[PDB]
């Protein structure tokens, strides 16, 4: 509806060419009924040419992703810290579009690959489009934009055979990580549950770089952007993520689409850490360094407003595929910093859209257009959609009365560089020595996780590094891990049959910071949209009655309920053939269905039991409803007294207990820990 | 209208980026006042990226041209001969756009090169866009589309050095013409005054190919399209065209622009010759052969309606440069024929727009859009400007209720191939023997010109062939010319110092046809827009008074008057420095200015007399107004008794006589003839 | 030819497709002798598709031009002023390609329009391609690259009707000149005989900007490039130029082509004015200001070597139309200055080749290739002609033994920024007041012409 002016309705009418001539498109024109096709068949050629040219280049990174429309609402008048118009009044609303993504995979790769995730937000402001092009991880692998192709070549598939897809689990990636120690912090985040989020809705977004807020008086402060999820944080477990990559490559885009259509559109508090210019080097690291966080203990979050996604696209290609974000899409009241990663990005995003669009007029695509007037002397180029009336498109002119007028700090609400910014020194291709500590913050992050989270991170590294063929690369990796934590290096080395190097305690410490643990972020604040699989049977009418009564009680609380049975019928959503534990956040067996848990042509041997066992092993709340639990729980080897295992006769009591389980989300006592 | 919706007004406001952010664009952002430019200067890069990408590939042919908007009005309900909707009612109006062009020159080449000229007309009909992509000459050089690159490579500049621009006067072109005798008919037209028309408004347009008109009952007739100029026919002389190419490379586009702005928008009667399907081979040649005309004596013209151009474009690049014509843009009621030149064109024009536009969505540019709804399953591609609501874009479907519906002869006013068409025989790459007479019609054309026109054509061939370096090519040329006319070959040979081959009378005859002669087409039906230069002086108050009284009386009759003098002042439009005889259709000297016709720092020596003499030598009406007369005519060696030479004291009597001269347009008795 | 390995010979043999299948190309395949053309006629479609796509975008400026190959020969070992390898020995020869042009006209406009002219030279050095992208007039219209589209829009045809072609003789151009007084110096040069040279061979070339020569020890000097014509200087007269624009739009390209074929290949002494860094503001104007010349009386020319053009192209499109010059094509021993016109050009020329070539691999076109090995981790892109053996194209790596190695001042003959260059002050979009005298040098130029 924000792009309603560009919509084309095909719910009625006769087929036409692109120039409005009514045609057919089902049979080629031929010289006789069993004859050759004619070149004069323009109906054929226009249709096939279009098809032949449908594809455009995938994004060079973040190729796999999905988007939605929404609204940003300001919680206050923020004039006292920024001139930005979209933040200048309590309750002020601005349309947004957001795209979420992975980084490394090509555009049909699985959502649930282990990776960094993008979170890109466009504010269609009344003073121009403003984009925050962020990730779900607050720090980046590298300290200089010029290194980006080195990073990306190393993590993408090996270029002789293009193996492996959407994965860091190969020699080249771990070679790069071990030789470029800046990578350690982002690596630790990606090897945590932050690399396999439960959904786009259950992850945060970060600007990563320090930016500036600039007031109308010219004064500036340093900021970091934080989008805090109102759905809570949650992750998958790796073994789950692997199966889900096969059973549902579209899991995250489906989850987002469904949440929006059910009226559960996801929300984030859009926040900033704000510090003075004088604190650039006050926190024991450089705020120009994008491998570093500011701990919340040193600078608290200020909540600026609400981001809500509540409308799905009409056409994916036209909206999601074509949206072209840029950190260069900046508005008055915001400015850059001398972060050498940010500085280079400003070049890349303007240039890459030429590749994607094939032409320079990509800002004229509906999804990229602003919602205010455009007044400039840009002309021509392939795909030019405007018809410009001003026939004197040069400045300075008298023949168009000196219009358009120049905008700056003092006239026309122009963008302006923060006027206190300076530069001083030699022109150098040198790294600031203030960037040289690559290991303390990785250690801060590791220290801040729970014991089971630390085990999962260790396990993710053991998984990936065990697939590295080069013994030299594996040694080099242990050398770098060892500088973060001797314990990590020892535990990782045990899996790959190497000795860890001797402890090097230069960067070891015991500091912790709040807000980076997933397990530690307590029960989820809402269980709406979570998925409950009810395993039933058509062989017992009482099993379907149990299923229907459970459905009513669970749906009342906004859970998405799937009843599973051997075959479809009224009340049954899915067959055992298509069902999997990866499709549910909790699994309930109705006790009328106990007999399935001891063969059928309608689903693979042991499928009903496998769903239950997989769900248990992956830490999910599981239960049996009806009061006869022993047969199912014994077949599964699930103890009745287990945490997150439910056994009740009463449907009401069953659901009350089970819903607490869904909020807990994962029962971490079911995972073994290294001594 | 898609044009009005995309018009952009920059007559007020502050400069913005393409995403609506107010900016400046006059100074680069630098590290200090004498420092280097910063990469983070997004204002710089967006502006320069746009400039860097302004150009698109020129058209492969017809790159040099100009366009205007107007209206077509039907004179009648033509249902009795065609189903075409734009012809289905008396007074029915359809918007048009027309582009006129040369063929061989690049953008930037001179309008007044000797060449075939394009005349491409788009009708934005209520049943889709219909294009007639025609030339100002009714026959084409070649008989099969597959030869087009051979023709075009031969006429375009030699590919080692890219010489010469916009000219057939070089060895490769005449090699091709002499080896491919199909070229003779079009060659004769191009070597006549049809190769150097006075304006786009003073030339006719032709579809060239035989097409079909198809009725709603399925019956068909064969047609040729003829656009007959209501301004009359007129040419330049070669020596004038050469000078004009240097003095004003924009002469034809200026003439069109100016006529439209003064409310003298040019008009054509849109006509057809209509013959029965059974007459395809009845006239002594094949109607599938595009090297042949139907003589008016064999099939008279039917006037279908009025084409008027009356509005200039707003932005040349957006409208004229981007307009993308196709013979494949056809409507119900029209069909193709098996002309092997037409057949191949249908492929070329769909394909080449991919080159020009850089992507498949070229029909979405405003100038290319239709004026009725588009309903089809074409999707995606670079530059996709629509948001399609139908999410089941396939046929057959139930999930969008079977829409869009198929259109055909019986439903939806679908296009349909003429149902009487058949094909029979071997699949062959062979030329029909009915196409083999390459010489009789060239001779018919030559016979139909006046003696002086025949001399001009011989003179154009003497000029071009004299510049061919190869003696063998020159001999081969005489061989082919000789098959058309022994006299032509004798007269051409005299200039290049070869002997003509012996007469070969196989194709010789004395038949003539009406309507192909320019000299023969009688006085112009209107003199509005024609240019009168009045040569005066600032020395003499009486010269300027003579000039002003002449101006008033000439401007009354719609003539564009320029008073020329040594310097500008009130009443004087142009200096002798910038004035040339090529800028006028008639030249008047006022008596008071006699002294200039016997040196000055304000213009080149002899410029005033040169303008007068050049005008006389090129056949234009010339005179002296004031009744001294003898001194100026003696200085010029212009005889007072000469046809188109005027000498009067009375301004009223002078103008009455002079205006008849302008209608006569050219005085051909001033050109020498071969014995 | 220097480009002999890429040449295709068609002086014998049978017509083939682009994939070597022998074919014909004179008649379409039809359903009967008077029948419609068949879609299965691949001979037709491959031929016509190629034709349909022959054209590329003309250059945004300098679209009308012509080129030739030649040789540059150094007169000495210039190590005392520059590390540049092509200048490091007496008699050292380097292949060149040069393109000359007008500025404003489209690619079939007249050579003898009144205009500034381009003079672009590529040296295919043994340390990489070095381009000097110069003009025949030593000063430019504007003082900041960001103004270039304003200048060019004003001088190009009015955008409602695209009139007039290749001429400053219209309201918009003179509006710009009169409102932007920086333009006065170049305007006076264009309005002199330098706007209508007799030939490309009878004009000089200038780098325009101050550049730096950098020695292997890191010290730098400021230079201006001057290519002095050994044929002399000569102009047309305007009335002559106008007539010639119609009688022979190809006059300058024909003149060059003919001179080369007759064994009269044109020559230039390649010269520099060399001054110390301390003289940037010593001559009464700023050397960062591209609207200013250094009078020969203040800094004399040093002759570095001979440029001779002596071989015409084989294929105009492939060589002349496709050559893609960049001031960013720099070699060790040369460096930029903070001239805000030069600074912006560095961005433009890399970007615009994407428009012309339609793809990122434009340096692989034969005319653009270097004459020395390429070792880098650039990969893929449309039109990729190389087959790279190194399957670890990232730095730092161990799996390709740390190759390619980094090159810099101290290893691998790397390019390096002149190490004494600094910046200091506010980040500003402000013009230096040292650039404000727009009128004295125009007057110096006018004073220096003869009465006629
Ligand atoms: C020097 C190059 C470079 C560097 C250092 C980065 N990126 Fe980037 N990024 C690109 C070059 C790039 C790109 C090649 O320009 C992409 C590809 C597609 C596009 O429009 O831009 C891109 C895409 C891209 C997307 C996808 C936007 C969308 O959904 O369409 C996200 C979310 C980011 N990037 C985020 C980041 C973050 C958070 C970074 C570091 C803090 C980062 N990028 C550094
Ligand atoms: C098989 C190729 C071929 C053949 C045989 C022809 N043409 Fe064509 N023509 C082209 C291939 C083409 C082209 C390459 O497709 C052009 C260049 C730009 C475009 O839109 O199509 C074109 C452009 C073009 C234009 C310019 C349209 C404009 O103003 O934009 C006109 C007026 C014609 N042609 C007319 C003719 C006529 C009357 C022909 C024979 C009767 C003819 N052409 C044969
Ligand atoms: C910021 C933009 C800009 C600015 C300030 C300039 N130019 Fe430029 N120039 C271009 C943008 C450009 C371009 C758009 O990037 C072109 C078009 C084609 C190409 O390869 O580069 C170009 C082409 C071009 C050519 C044609 C090279 C060839 O023959 O292919 C010459 C000789 C010059 N320029 C010379 C200059 C000189 C002597 C300048 C000032 C001292 C100058 N340009 C400033
Ligand atoms: Ca690998
Ligand atoms: Ca976790
Ligand atoms: Ca392209
Ligand atoms: Ca030739
Ligand atoms: Ca049909
Ligand atoms: Ca103008
Ligand atoms: Ca002179």
Author numbering:
A (entry chain D), B (entry chain A): 21 to 618, 622 to 698
C (entry chain C): 21 to 472
Task: Please share excerpts from the published article on this structure.
Catalases (hydrogen-peroxide:hydrogen-peroxide oxido­reductases; EC 1.11.1.6) are redox enzymes that are responsible for the dismutation of hydrogen peroxide into water and molecular oxygen. The structures reveal a homotetrameric enzyme in which each of the four active sites consists of a pentacoordinated iron protoporphyrin IX prosthetic group with a tyrosin­ate axial ligand. The heme is deeply buried inside the protein, with a complex network of channels providing access to the exterior. We have previously shown that in addition to catalase activity, the catalase from S. thermophilum (CATPO) possesses a promiscuous phenolic oxidase activity in the absence of hydrogen peroxide.
We therefore generated a series of site-directed mutants around the putative 3TR/catechol binding pocket to further test this hypothesis. The residues Pro158, His246, Gln293, Ile313, Ile314, Glu316, Leu321 and Val536 surround the 3TR binding pocket and are structurally homologous to the residues that bind NADPH in the mammalian catalases. Specifically, the variants P158W, H246W, Q293W, I313F, I314F, E316F, E316H, L321A, V536A and V536W were constructed. The catechol oxidase activities of the H246W, I314F, L321A and V536W variants were noticeably reduced (50–92%) with respect to the wild-type enzyme, whereas the E316F, E316H, I313F and V536A variants of CATPO had little effect on the oxidase activity. A similar picture is seen for His246, which lies directly below and perpendicular to the 3TR ring in the CATPO–3TR complex.
